[PDB]
């Protein structure tokens, strides 16, 4: 019957009425890339390629969550210590106002007493519809609430504590109750993380997005999820985020493969591998990460008002995203600006990725651990030194 497809277009010639004309509909018009999500009867896709202004028709691929379960006063999970976050908190817990982290995942238990105060914005992109309603944005799986707690669980007398326990979180639900998500919804969730709550990327028109107090963009997009497919419009959204000054962090994958899933495999994205508490790379961790982090036996928040232990590269990812939030929060607190994102290759202290690379606890890049295990305390020293 009806398939979902993503059309790359020339906006001067693409007439959307041509798709309604063949029994299709417009699902979502991207604001930041020239592309549109459409539903068409499957036997009419051939007619789509043929319309004026249609440059490419791509099918809607599937990505999936990358965390799975391991089988009272406040605990500091072993991974938060390993990554050397508690030492940083006298400088910053990430609570500097221009800083937000967007977590594209299964949603969040937004009224969880260890999370709520840091939940700044809650949205859903599922099924190509942007929803800002609470029932839509709530986590129906648990995995997002877990990823989120590793980043930002409160420092208090309950539960757990995240890497950056003061940072504002934008929860962006791009994955359903089963942890499965379409590339379409994930590209839309990324656009939303750039647009933010006011729906405009660059409201004052000055060319600054991430790190501009006049805007409400996130500064980190964290994606603990992956698929085998490399689609154009998705990689275009990645570049829009990258160009806006957003650091993008994604899980390597859990199939013990030689290279990362997507989007972790894009040059603009920090691929993240998983270690255990013995500083062994997990066997499941996809190889050639950029950096690695705690991803086995990770205790964190879980629905509802509860706590759970999970494992996977999905768990390693938010430790890195939390480190990035500390670097950017410390740098903005001292200077009144953030660092550039940087590249895989980078070994300077002038770039977030540069700092991640050279402060990593290398156990010189390798195909197992990447540059090594991120260390917040040392990264924040490099950023400020
Ligand atoms: Ca911001
Ligand atoms: Ca806590
Ligand atoms: Ca905005
Ligand atoms: Ca601006
Ligand atoms: Ca401005």
Tab-separated table of C-alpha atoms and ligand atoms in Angstrom, residues 201-209 212 214-215, ligand 4:
chain	number	residue	atom	x	y	z
A	201	UNK	CA	17.557	28.263	13.952
A	202	UNK	CA	19.143	31.744	14.051
A	203	UNK	CA	16.544	34.132	15.363
A	204	UNK	CA	18.668	37.268	15.355
A	205	UNK	CA	20.231	36.424	11.924
A	206	UNK	CA	23.803	36.805	13.094
A	207	UNK	CA	25.186	33.421	11.896
A	208	UNK	CA	25.729	32.059	15.408
A	209	UNK	CA	23.510	29.173	16.642
A	212	UNK	CA	24.536	32.138	21.149
A	214	UNK	CA	20.100	34.884	21.906
A	215	UNK	CA	19.157	31.486	20.532
B	4	LIG	CA1	22.051	33.804	16.418
